[PDB]
Design an enzyme around this catalytic site. Structure first.
Site, PDB file in Angstrom:
ATOM      1  N   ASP A 105       0.847  -1.189   0.000  1.00 22.39           N
ATOM      2  CA  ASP A 105       0.000   0.000   0.000  1.00 22.39           C
ATOM      3  C   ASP A 105       0.882   1.238   0.000  1.00 22.39           C
ATOM      4  O   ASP A 105       1.677   1.428   0.928  1.00 22.39           O
ATOM      5  CB  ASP A 105      -0.938   0.045   1.207  1.00 22.39           C
ATOM      6  N   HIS A 122      -7.683   9.285  -2.624  1.00 19.93           N
ATOM      7  CA  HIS A 122      -7.146   9.144  -1.269  1.00 19.93           C
ATOM      8  C   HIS A 122      -8.113   9.666  -0.216  1.00 19.93           C
ATOM      9  O   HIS A 122      -8.282   9.041   0.842  1.00 19.93           O
ATOM     10  CB  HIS A 122      -5.802   9.870  -1.197  1.00 19.93           C
TER      11      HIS A 122
HETATM   12  N1  LIG Z   1      -5.981   5.754   3.130  1.00 20.92           N
HETATM   13  C1  LIG Z   1      -5.590   6.513   4.145  1.00 20.92           C
HETATM   14  O1  LIG Z   1      -6.026   7.654   4.340  1.00 20.92           O
HETATM   15  C2  LIG Z   1      -4.593   5.937   5.097  1.00 20.92           C
HETATM   16  C3  LIG Z   1      -4.435   6.479   6.370  1.00 20.92           C
HETATM   17  C4  LIG Z   1      -3.617   5.853   7.290  1.00 20.92           C
HETATM   18  C5  LIG Z   1      -2.934   4.715   6.925  1.00 20.92           C
HETATM   19  N2  LIG Z   1      -3.060   4.232   5.670  1.00 20.92           N
HETATM   20  C6  LIG Z   1      -2.256   3.024   5.248  1.00 20.92           C
HETATM   21  O2  LIG Z   1      -2.342   2.042   6.258  1.00 20.92           O
HETATM   22  C7  LIG Z   1      -1.017   1.681   6.710  1.00 20.92           C
HETATM   23  C8  LIG Z   1      -1.055   1.204   8.139  1.00 20.92           C
HETATM   24  O3  LIG Z   1      -1.517   2.246   9.031  1.00 20.92           O
HETATM   25  P1  LIG Z   1      -0.499   3.096   9.912  1.00 20.92           P
HETATM   26  O4  LIG Z   1       0.832   3.226   9.262  1.00 20.92           O
HETATM   27  O5  LIG Z   1      -1.234   4.329  10.259  1.00 20.92           O
HETATM   28  O6  LIG Z   1      -0.328   2.268  11.273  1.00 20.92           O
HETATM   29  P2  LIG Z   1      -0.360   0.771  11.819  1.00 20.92           P
HETATM   30  O7  LIG Z   1      -0.081  -0.168  10.719  1.00 20.92           O
HETATM   31  O8  LIG Z   1      -1.605   0.631  12.616  1.00 20.92           O
HETATM   32  O9  LIG Z   1       0.836   0.854  12.892  1.00 20.92           O
HETATM   33  C9  LIG Z   1       2.192   1.077  12.450  1.00 20.92           C
HETATM   34  C10 LIG Z   1       3.032   1.154  13.696  1.00 20.92           C
HETATM   35  O10 LIG Z   1       2.977  -0.111  14.401  1.00 20.92           O
HETATM   36  C11 LIG Z   1       4.293  -0.587  14.619  1.00 20.92           C
HETATM   37  N3  LIG Z   1       4.270  -2.035  14.528  1.00 20.92           N
HETATM   38  C12 LIG Z   1       4.106  -2.767  13.381  1.00 20.92           C
HETATM   39  N4  LIG Z   1       4.096  -4.060  13.571  1.00 20.92           N
HETATM   40  C13 LIG Z   1       4.259  -4.195  14.943  1.00 20.92           C
HETATM   41  C14 LIG Z   1       4.342  -5.317  15.773  1.00 20.92           C
HETATM   42  N5  LIG Z   1       4.277  -6.569  15.325  1.00 20.92           N
HETATM   43  N6  LIG Z   1       4.523  -5.106  17.092  1.00 20.92           N
HETATM   44  C15 LIG Z   1       4.609  -3.850  17.539  1.00 20.92           C
HETATM   45  N7  LIG Z   1       4.535  -2.713  16.847  1.00 20.92           N
HETATM   46  C16 LIG Z   1       4.364  -2.955  15.540  1.00 20.92           C
HETATM   47  C17 LIG Z   1       5.162   0.083  13.560  1.00 20.92           C
HETATM   48  O11 LIG Z   1       6.520   0.161  14.042  1.00 20.92           O
HETATM   49  P3  LIG Z   1       7.809  -0.057  13.100  1.00 20.92           P
HETATM   50  O12 LIG Z   1       7.449   0.408  11.713  1.00 20.92           O
HETATM   51  O13 LIG Z   1       8.853   0.811  13.783  1.00 20.92           O
HETATM   52  O14 LIG Z   1       8.128  -1.537  13.152  1.00 20.92           O
HETATM   53  C18 LIG Z   1       4.510   1.459  13.468  1.00 20.92           C
HETATM   54  O15 LIG Z   1       4.930   2.323  14.518  1.00 20.92           O
HETATM   55  C19 LIG Z   1      -0.230   2.953   6.440  1.00 20.92           C
HETATM   56  O16 LIG Z   1       1.177   2.772   6.493  1.00 20.92           O
HETATM   57  C20 LIG Z   1      -0.760   3.324   5.057  1.00 20.92           C
HETATM   58  O17 LIG Z   1      -0.167   2.444   4.100  1.00 20.92           O
HETATM   59  C21 LIG Z   1      -3.868   4.807   4.764  1.00 20.92           C
END
Ligand SMILES: NC(=O)c1ccc[n+]([C@@H]2O[C@H](COP(=O)([O-])OP(=O)(O)OC[C@H]3O[C@@H](n4cnc5c(N)ncnc54)[C@H](OP(=O)(O)O)[C@@H]3O)[C@@H](O)[C@H]2O)c1
Ligand SMILES: O=C(O)COc1cc(F)ccc1C(=O)NCc1cccc(C(=O)O)c1
Length: 316
Positions: free
Chosen positions: A44, A111
């Site tokens: 993504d 988006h």
């Molecule tokens: N369409 C939209 O408007 C929109 C908005 C928000 C997000 N998104 C997409 O969704 C993705 C995921 O959401 P997000 O980035 O907001 O957050 P998330 O995936 O909920 O959380 C990411 C965080 O969790 C940590 N983490 C990951 N795996 C872990 C594990 N096994 N144990 C402990 N901590 C862990 C990561 O740390 P490390 O990276 O340091 O390991 C990072 O700090 C985004 O990256 C993006 O691609 C889209």
């Protein structure tokens, strides 16, 4: 649990993908390489994340190494808000394709439903701090997305952060040519989204859950905010299944027939997060996790709350 879900364009989408928002440019190439090595087939992306070039380096290297074939990958990106005008959509898609070093995207999303004034700034502001809208509407932007399918740039088109009335506006669009394949929305045990999910699924639109771990690295986090990964009730469910809390948080949306896109740049977590096809949450576990809803949003779009297309005034 099958690994892919069938979309309404006839293509199959991997239910687990790697998120890339906040992945630093100097780490995301390795993160994506590791992800592909350990089985991820869906990444993504978004232009606004400012790291598509580096994501692309990883994809291209793994294709060149023949770790994977292009047809086995499912690459998603998103049209940023300052590109909603008819005449800018193709160039925005093409810039993403160039950066990702691809000749098509598997899925391209609007988006956010809110269009902003075009220009260099991703959040153009007036002198008093409000985002400057564009007079584009959702339906004309959708028609521009449909043209990308007909030009071969993207295999599927969809939407993100659309509320159910905005989804309905597209579904009722005069002359609609392609239905949205996906609505990508925030979803986790503190924002369970039952109403919007049911609506989208009833229309054959697949839902992708973003921020499934509660985005602990979001830049606006406050120490007092709830923390999914530290919630003792979720930790207890994980312990019962001999899995990590993150693994439970990833498996949860999968069992609701959602796609889920956890982000990590940590190699051990990238691998851990993929090991979620070897256990099942019970119906009771699922209902218990749903019970934790508190309508808490990582991504509230709080500087766009006066935009005519702001999505989060409606209940869902
Ligand atoms: N369409 C939209 O408007 C929109 C908005 C928000 C997000 N998104 C997409 O969704 C993705 C995921 O959401 P997000 O980035 O907001 O957050 P998330 O995936 O909920 O959380 C990411 C965080 O969790 C940590 N983490 C990951 N795996 C872990 C594990 N096994 N144990 C402990 N901590 C862990 C990561 O740390 P490390 O990276 O340091 O390991 C990072 O700090 C985004 O990256 C993006 O691609 C889209
Ligand atoms: O909108 C996403 O996908 C995640 O939030 C962002 C990500 C960025 F790279 C830049 C701004 C945002 C942001 O403020 N969004 C909320 C509108």
């Amino acid at each position: 649990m099958a690994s892919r879900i069938l979309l309404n364009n006839g293509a199959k989408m991997p239910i687990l993908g790697l998120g890339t928002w906040k992945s630093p440019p100097g780490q995301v190439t390795e993160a994506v390489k590791v992800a592909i090595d350990v089985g991820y087939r869906h990444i993504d992306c978004a232009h606004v994340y400012q790291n598509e070039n580096e994501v692309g380096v990883a994809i291209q290297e793994k294709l060149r190494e023949q770790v994977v074939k292009r047809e086995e990958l499912f690459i998603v990106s998103k049209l940023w808000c300052t590109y909603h005008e008819k005449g800018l959509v193709k160039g925005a898609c093409q810039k993403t394709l160039s950066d990702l070093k691809l000749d098509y995207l598997d899925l391209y999303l609007i988006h956010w439903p809110t269009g902003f004034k075009p220009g260099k700034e991703f959040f153009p502001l007036d002198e008093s701090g409000n985002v400057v809208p564009s007079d584009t509407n959702i339906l004309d932007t959708w028609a521009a997305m449909e043209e990308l399918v007909d030009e071969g740039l993207v295999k599927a088109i969809g939407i993100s952060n659309f509320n159910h009335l905005q989804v309905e506006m597209i579904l009722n669009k005069p002359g609609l040519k392609y239905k949205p394949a996906v609505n990508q929305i925030e979803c986790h045990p503190y924002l369970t989204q039952e109403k919007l999910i049911q609506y989208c699924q009833s229309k054959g639109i697949v839902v992708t859950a973003y921020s499934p771990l509660g985005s602990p690295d979001r830049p606006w986090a406050k120490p007092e905010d709830p923390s999914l990964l530290e919630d003792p009730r979720i930790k207890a469910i994980a312990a019962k299944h001999n899995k990590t809390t993150a693994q439970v948080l990833i498996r949860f949306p999968m069992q609701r027939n959602l796609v889920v896109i956890p982000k990590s740049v940590t190699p051990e977590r990238i691998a851990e997060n993929f090991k979620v096809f070897d256990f099942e949450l019970s119906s009771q576990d699922m209902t218990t996790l749903l019970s934790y809803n508190r309508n808490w949003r990582v991504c509230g779009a709080l500087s766009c709350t006066s935009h005519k297309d702001y999505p989060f005034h409606e209940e869902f």
